[PDB]
Design a protein around this ligand. Structure first.
Ligand code: NA
Ligand code: NA
Ligand code: NA
Lengths: 62, 63
RNA sequence: CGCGCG
RNA sequence: CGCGCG
């Protein structure tokens, strides 16, 4: 997916083990947070991302 | 509108409750808006939110 | 306030 | 699936 690739690339740019929020991704990638989150939770289900549950949750490459 | 929901849930009958989904259909209002109003009415002590899923809403029993 | 929800 | 979220 186009969006999946953008998100995964953003994270890879940060360096190994680094995490970000949907809030941040939404701003930097110019994409509504609802869409960001739809793709973040999906990727996690596919095992491509790890969610660190919090408020807000943090997301990294799996 | 708060007064619209209160009247409808009043006319539903004594001790009767229904869902936001049901109110949404019956009042021709998006569930989003229905729910915003229900939760605010509960804060105000005018409705009771029953536990469970989907939540049930009824007129508060008052003193 | 965690919200991804169709 | 509970969603009301500004
Ligand atoms: Na409800
Ligand atoms: Na929802
Ligand atoms: Na929300």
């Amino acid at each position: 997916s186009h969006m999946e690739q953008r998100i995964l690339k953003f994270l890879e740019e940060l360096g190994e083990g680094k995490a970000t929020t949907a809030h941040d991704l939404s701003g930097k990638l110019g994409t509504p947070k609802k869409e960001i989150n739809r793709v973040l939770y999906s990727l996690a289900k596919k095992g491509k991302l790890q969610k660190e549950a919090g408020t807000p949750p943090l997301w990294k490459i799996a």
